[PDB]
């Protein structure tokens, strides 16, 4: 009911990735799901103008959309890409592909 | 249609914090309004996770929930509160307040 980390696993050729992502072919990447209500949880790390428009939210349904609960957080990953030569090369910090921590934002 | 910053006028007594905010009566807090969906803007600033999960959004609508408009950077302001004993402070950056800038997350 609350902002949580679950999983998704992302198929390369799904996303239209693997025309240039030799390897892997499927990976964790986690995804962000929950709804930021009151009362909030401990560890959601809610900001303040994510509080607010949650409560303005409360008073005006239709004018004000509430807080998202989105990746405050991201890990990398290696993936063995073709470089403008063709040969597969390793990249192995790939940044902001997998989800850390979640939070109300 | 795309992420982007607009106005939020938030009445502290709407929100119930008139209680311990005596000044000011209202703020401009802003809000991240928009759409995550391709193609992108030059200045939302998107993560490699938002951009996969748009791309799984788009084969799994069902399954998958789409990237959401965010801010990710905020800005403070200024408030005169109630101390516990009764005078008005001046708390002079109440942080997390305003939006400077949003983003898809
Ligand atoms: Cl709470
Ligand atoms: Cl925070
Ligand atoms: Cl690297
Ligand atoms: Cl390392
Ligand atoms: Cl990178
Ligand atoms: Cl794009
Ligand atoms: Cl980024
Ligand atoms: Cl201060
Ligand atoms: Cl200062
Ligand atoms: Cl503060
Ligand atoms: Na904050
Ligand atoms: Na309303
Ligand atoms: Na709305
Ligand atoms: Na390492
Ligand atoms: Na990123
Ligand atoms: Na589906
Ligand atoms: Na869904
Ligand atoms: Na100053």
Same mark, same amino acid.
């Given at each position: ?42 560890? *959601? ?6 509080? !607010?428009? /949650? =409560? ?7 004018? %004000?959309?509430?807080?998202?609960c ?8 290696? *993936? ?6 063709? !040969?597969? /090369? =390793?990249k ?6 997998? %989800? ?6």
């Amino acid at each position: 009911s609350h902002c949580q980390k679950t999983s998704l696993r992302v198929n390369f050729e799904d996303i239209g990735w693997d025309s240039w992502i030799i390897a892997p072919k499927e990976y964790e990447a986690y995804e962000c799901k929950g709804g930021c209500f009151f009362p909030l949880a401990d560890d *959601v790390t809610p900001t303040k103008h994510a509080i !607010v428009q /949650t =409560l303005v939210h409360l008073k005006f349904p239709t004018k %004000v959309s509430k807080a998202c609960c989105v990746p405050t957080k991201l890990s990398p990953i290696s *993936v063995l890409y073709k470089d403008d030569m063709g !040969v597969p /090369t =390793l990249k192995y910090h790939y940044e902001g592909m997998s %989800v850390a921590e979640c939070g109300c934002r």
